[PDB]
Amino acid sequence: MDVRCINWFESHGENRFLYLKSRCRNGETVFIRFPHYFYYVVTDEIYQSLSPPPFNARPMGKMRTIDIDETISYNLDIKDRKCSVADMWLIEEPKKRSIQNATMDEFFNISWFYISNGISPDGCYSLDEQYLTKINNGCYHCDDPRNCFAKEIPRFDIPRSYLFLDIECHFDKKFPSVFINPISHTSYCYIDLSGKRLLFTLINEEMLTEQEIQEAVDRGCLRIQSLMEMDYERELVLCSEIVLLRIAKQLLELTFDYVVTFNGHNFDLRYITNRLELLTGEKIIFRSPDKKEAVHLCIYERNQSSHKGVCGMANTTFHVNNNNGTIFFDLYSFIQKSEKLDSYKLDSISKNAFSCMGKVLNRGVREMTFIGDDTTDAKGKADTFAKVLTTGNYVTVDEDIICKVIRKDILENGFKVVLSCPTLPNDIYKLSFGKDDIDLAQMYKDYNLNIALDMARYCIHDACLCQYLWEYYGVETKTDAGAATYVLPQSMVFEYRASTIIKGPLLKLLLETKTILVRSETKQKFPYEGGKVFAVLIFDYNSLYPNVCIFGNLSPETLVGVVVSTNRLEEEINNQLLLQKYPPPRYITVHCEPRLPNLISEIAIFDRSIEGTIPRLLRTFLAERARYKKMLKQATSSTEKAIYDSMQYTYKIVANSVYGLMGFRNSALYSYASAKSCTSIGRRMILYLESVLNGAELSNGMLRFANTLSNPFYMDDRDINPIVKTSLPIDYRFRFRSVYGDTDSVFTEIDSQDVDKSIEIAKELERLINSRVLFNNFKIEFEAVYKNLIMQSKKKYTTMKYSASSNSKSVPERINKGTSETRRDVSKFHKNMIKTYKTRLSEMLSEGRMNSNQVCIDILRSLETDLRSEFDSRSSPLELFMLSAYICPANVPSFKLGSNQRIFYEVYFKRLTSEIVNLLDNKVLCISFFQRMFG
Amino acid sequence: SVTISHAPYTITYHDDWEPVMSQLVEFYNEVASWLLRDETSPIPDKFFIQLKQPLRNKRVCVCGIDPYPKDGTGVPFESPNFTKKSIKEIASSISRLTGVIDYKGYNLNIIDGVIPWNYYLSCKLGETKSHAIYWDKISKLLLQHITKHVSVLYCLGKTDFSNIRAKLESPVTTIVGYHPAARDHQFEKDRSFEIINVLLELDNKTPINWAQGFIY
Amino acid sequence: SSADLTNLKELLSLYKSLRFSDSVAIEKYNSLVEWGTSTYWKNSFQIPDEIRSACNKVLDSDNGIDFLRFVLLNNRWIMEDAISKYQSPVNIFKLASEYGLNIPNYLEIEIEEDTLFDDELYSIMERSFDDTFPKISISYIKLGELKRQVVDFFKFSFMYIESIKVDRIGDNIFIPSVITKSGKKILVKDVDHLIRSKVREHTFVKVKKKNTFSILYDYDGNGIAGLKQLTNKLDINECATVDELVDEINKSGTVKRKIKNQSVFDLSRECLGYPEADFITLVNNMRFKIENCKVVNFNIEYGNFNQFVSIFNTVTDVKKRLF
């Protein structure tokens, strides 16, 4: 009996159970019920002295228990770790037990249920039906998940139900209330198992005159006054609010696989439940698959901060309390969690997710036709944009141009769309989807039939946006990847932090290496630098910190000791005894930063003879992500191209999350030394590269690297010679000036300032600066920031100006990646002139020869004459500001102005010229111009 | 005594409730129509009788969650015949600090310093937690105003009170508790009592005399 | 739970008496402040155990007291008063005497009308206290209140110090007493101004001097060795040979346990006359160059440092030879 697992959930009642929702080969759904236990790892002597005897105990072999408490030491006589080796056992307790000196207590019982039984949460199995007794139609009982989930077959494909919904409510306040305002429309995107994608919008009768209701029934709609009277094949339906809410309740109680919605946990589902209770006095009944437990829909919060101060804000996320297996998903919470966008409205999210390009076909009065094809613009973007156009109404051209469509044509490939926008000169225009300029508040004060139907369209498009976005973010495959990398149920994948996802891989590891890390001592905190700020080519490190915790073999259990020295003349004695004792390269002594004064040494000693748990974890993660990148490079199907992409991304996310998890106090990977160590090794490596990257190159085969290629942390006899021999054309002159970098970049100042001469030389340097200057597993990569991409501040303060791999006949673009100046709630008058002031700001940084005089006189004259011309002419319109109102006196040297034109810009006008000083090399003209700008 | 639209058509309060009482009127007016759609307990005539009690001379709030569905009285945990469930239990479990056992009644409304507070000011008679939807806003508001004049909070509830810090826009000493509505009353393992006393010292308030409330 | 009541009562108790608390006491103070906020959202030397029992008994003789004010001066645990809310001083003093503790005596002329302490009421008081102990104390007790407002007499002036050395405080123990300019050895009370404080000889330093005794005066604005001084600094014998030293250390049973648990920078700065305070502040000011765990070169970038290196190499060598 073959099944594929969709979701794992537990019953929250008197009886603890664990359910498996799975789809068979032929599309039938079967649930399986496992007794849920508590799991305790207990040594042999404890097990033998147990009273009463445990319910079930299975051996675990000889595990070594390692005490990983870090004890500082003021002399070089460090006692070795306390490491026992005992025969362990696994105790399975139906009801919780208080058992003393039991270890491995940081791992959930669901992780144990998976690992001990050898079950992947997303695998596809051939269940030995000899054990699954039947309790009711569609539910089996499995007492022995060991011998029933034995034979594991390869992954096959199954059908999956869905429901993407959205509602709209009457209002005159900012947000409606369940008591005063009734819901107007209610749209759905019901995707059955068979594949039937049915869209339909229910409209509220009771806001219409009977005359317009009859007009609508004449026009095209259906009318229902009962529940059994509706059918989802009709695209528009008119009904009261009681039948509307009863249909909503009838849908939400179905066993869909997912029920997706954007911020539909806080607003939509809550509004529906509350209003249904008010109107009809009914509730939404989620029944358990064994029909032996029914709950009512009730939304509950879950604060997410792993550290909460006083008077702060934690991202409270609302969840449904359903217990039937359906994964009530909310795209809003997922998007806020996974990606750090600029804003999180559905409109802007769409406008940045569904994009394409459109070439003008035939202009006209108040109209314009755009074509978008695969062979012309980026492959796949035209197809997704044509998938969004089937329901959308208001298409957005490159900027601030929102146009109501007139006619849309979905070709076999591409799209042709007519827009009601005034004439535009340029032939190409980038089309993004969605801002929908409508006065809903005003549209509700004159509600009639045409407006009812307009809003029904507005609502069905918003209900289908939650499907286009659900497919864009590949959530259905990221879920099944996370539910297998992190050994967790498909429902608990995005609900938790790193400290919770990391425990499945870690527990699977500790049963190979047979270690058990314990801590019989409390931990102390020492605050640190949580974020770096700083200010040509761009080479980055291949996941620097996993590579460092693998190079240095950093771990809590492979720490020999932290030899510290109070003051001078003891650090020296200790340094000499650390040069003789603990010698390279089996031990590595890293000079961490002093944890408390008075101390000047804090040297940490790591033994590099056995692979710790953390470095072995990281190596497995890197190896699997590499395997999946390879398997994706060779993927032929369009489904495998998604499965393997999701798996690779999952391994990336779980690998990058370990370094932050070592400095996190209440974590299963905590070690103050290793955290403070890999931060110092990485910094030393970065500074080493910066040291040897300031070297000139001439008479090809020099690239002197500016210094001897001396390996840090020890000598290694690696042909230490600055002058190397490259393989590029002979006559060259370029020097690379100072490089700064943060941790995942080292920008070197190339003295060429042109493409086609950097891409080649940099691609041949990166091969020569990661095979001749780096040592063990510190690889590098390469990109290029074309013509001084504005480096205002730390990482997320730049423009895009992309030049990745090709520079011959290549197409760059320079819109933005700032995520720093795009947000409203600010002025609208004087700024947005950057859209006109950038063409002269991007051009004052792209000359190199006349650049100095041009930029200085340009900033000076431009800003002084902008001040005077705004004070005299009153020219700039009121459009936007675009920076992340205010009033200020103008008498001395809804957003509407005053009588003196120097009201509120005298601060932004100097903050702007303050932001843009770190892109030149002038130290006298720039700062003096700044000082004189005040008068 | 502000005059609301629906029952009881007016709410007489104490002089220390005006920092809130104004918006309570609209909060109650938008929900009253459905609120009095069913006869609740307490009756609509004693919804806000606890709004008569001053908050200056009080420093501890033993916050229940919902009144006794079988005819609560508008003052939490009170008993006109001392024959209820949780009140006799807490009187018993508190009969050990004072060391006395003789009581004809024990209301927290006469312990000078403590104020019994019902989170949800009403419930459908016979049902529990059945008027939460009608009360959420006013309940959060009344609690936030009760905590800005006193400083201690003893939520008599195990899981009913789980996110109390979220529904409070200001830091106040939020002690928690375990609902003795369960079996064994669960009050023996945890000595919740006298923790209020210890915590009333770090700002020099007087300890609660839990004997002040018996009937003699 | 009751377990929580334990640390809560401890928090309250220690919060009541921060003034007399220890380092681990203020540690528990802040740790319990945090353990409370994260659940509810808002010295002297060692006193013997045969003395600890009597002190625990005397703390109960009158429970109005919070701590035991033991004056730790010149390796003497001499108390001047027991701060007990109701207990008289003479009763606690008689109890301590029955236990074997150092209680002082009072000799003064009392007046039925309180007169303001002045030149006479401090000089004659110091001269009439008749106590043969080293202290500038002028002591009194008033009936009706337990507050302590002590008086004393001296005058601040300048003098040029003699050296950085010691005066024999006890048996084979020379505790540092920098001799005054006239010749007297000053009476240093607390280890703050007693280790090597202002070791500077011939320096014009301002101190609060009197006719016989005195005290050190800190600034207001801007702010001699050998094997001999090692053998008596841990009290085994007098010596001038390393073999003698190590052999006498072997002959001991507890002195070896004392050396085993001390560092060599400590032991070499403690038996030299300036353990930590400004020493390290200078040893960090100097670049160093050593070999085989023996300093051989130094460069500034106090006075007993050359000889300090000379005895430091010696203690390192004897520790190596013994261990």
Author numbering:
A (entry chain A): 1 to 535, 545 to 893, 931 to 939, 957 to 998
B (entry chain B): 3 to 218
C (entry chain C): 3 to 44, 102 to 282, 313 to 390, 404 to 425
Describing publication, verbatim:
The MPXV DNA polymerase holoenzyme, consisting of F8, A22, and E4, is vital for replicating the viral genome and represents a crucial target for the development of antiviral drugs. Similar to vaccinia virus (VACV), another well-studied member of Poxviridae, the DNA polymerase holoenzyme of MPXV encoded by the viral genome contains three proteins: the uracil-DNA glycosylase E4, the processivity factor A22, and the DNA polymerase F8 belonging to the B-family polymerases, which correspond to D4, A20, and E9 in VACV, respectively. A22 works as a bridge for connecting F8 and E4, among which E4 is crucial for the association of viral DNA templates with enzymes to process efficiently. Here, we found the two different states of DNA replication holoenzyme from MPXV, which could be induced by the dsDNA to transition an inactive hexameric form into a more active trimeric form.
To explore the molecular mechanism of DNA replication by MPXV, we tried to incubate the dsDNA substrate with the hexameric complex form. To our surprise, the addition of the exogenous dsDNA leads to the increase of a latter peak on gel filtration and it still contains the bands of F8/A22/E4 on SDS–polyacrylamide gel electrophoresis (SDS-PAGE), which might represent another state of the holoenzyme. We then collected the latter peak fractions and prepared the cryo-EM sample. When supplied with an exogenous dsDNA, the hexameric form of the holoenzyme changed into a trimeric form, notably exposing the DNA binding site of the thumb domain. Middle and right: Map comparison of the trimeric and hexameric form complex shows that A22 undergoes marked conformational change during oligomer state shift. The trimeric structure of the F8/A22/E4 complex might exhibit as a more active state due to the loss of the interface between the thumb domain of F8 and A22′, thus releasing the dsDNA binding site of F8. Once the dsDNA substrate or another factor binds to the holoenzyme, it can trigger a conformational change into a trimeric complex, releasing the DNA binding site of the thumb domain. However, we could not get the DNA substrate-bound structure when using both peak fractions.
